[PDB]
Every structure is written in structure tokens, then in C-alpha cells.
Amino acid sequence: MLPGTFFEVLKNEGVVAIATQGEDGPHLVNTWNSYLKVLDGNRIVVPVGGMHKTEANVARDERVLMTLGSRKVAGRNGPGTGFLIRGSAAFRTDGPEFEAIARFKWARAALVITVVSAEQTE
């Protein structure tokens, strides 16, 4: 499951980055630390407004990478830390995963990331 420090980062606002495999190279989109909803410590839910290219990419290769951090949380060499998350992505338009982000009216779906690994990179 995700470590306590990961949740500490989530107590602070920040920019989350999500990389996927495009056909002409990688693609990169974002979300906010404050938007992420974690289910039972091993699945991360992201509210999807756009992410059309991203969804197309996931349909071809479900592997995704996600990073996030906060200068307000202690890392391993002083103030500031973050994580590199590797996992498989899936889009849902119903179910408890969607309900987790349904609060966001502009959300057309939920991007569900099943975490395989989490590395504190700083």
C-alpha cells in the first residue's frame, strides 16, 4: 500500500503529472494534489474532464506513470519530497470509482490507476 509520506504530500496542493505512451512519443497531462482520491491505499482516482488523447493512449497501452510532491513535506535530504508512481490505468464512467470523483461536475469519467509501485524519488 502507499506510504504515509505519500498521504502527507496529498495534504498539500500541487501539480500531479500523468504520462502515457502516445503514437508519436509520450504524452503528459496533469491534475491537482487536492483532486486525487485514493481507494484502500492502492488505487488512485483522478477526475477526468478532458484527457481525450490520454484515454486513447491508455486504450492502446494501459501503463502510466504519475509524479507528485510538495516542498512542505520532508524528503530524505531535507525539506521537499515527491514520488514516481507506476501503474495500470483504466477509465470508468460508473461504479464506486466514478462516485469517488463524481463531486466534480465537469467530470466525464474517472481515471483509475492501479498502483504497481511507488518510489520516493526525493
Q: Would you tell me which residues interact with its own copies (CB under 8 A)? A: 13-15, 17, 19-21, 25-30, 32, 34, 61, 63, 65-71, 80, 82, 84, 121-122
Grid cell digits, residue 5: 509520506
Q: Which is nearer to ligand FMN, 69 or 87 (CB)?
A: 69
d(CA 28, CA 104) in angstroms, rounded, equals 21
Minimum CB separation of residue 95 from its own copies in Å reads 26
CA distances from 35 to 11, 61, 77, 119 (A): 11, 24, 27, 21
User: 54 and 18 in contact (C-beta within 8 Å)?
Assistant: yes
Binders of ligand FMN among residues 45 to 84 (CB under 6 A) are 47-54, 69, 82
Q: What radius of gyration, in Å, describes the C-alpha atoms of the chain?
A: 14
**Taking Cα atoms as reference points, which of 60, 43, 47, 56 lies closest to residue 93?**
47
Minimum CB separation of residue 33 from ligand FMN in Å reads 10
Residue 113 touching ligand FMN (CB under 6 A)? no
Residue from 19, 22, 35, 114 binding ligand FMN (CB under 6 A): 35
Using CB under 6 A, list all residues that contact ligand FMN.
Answer: 15, 29-32, 35, 47-54, 69, 82, 121-122
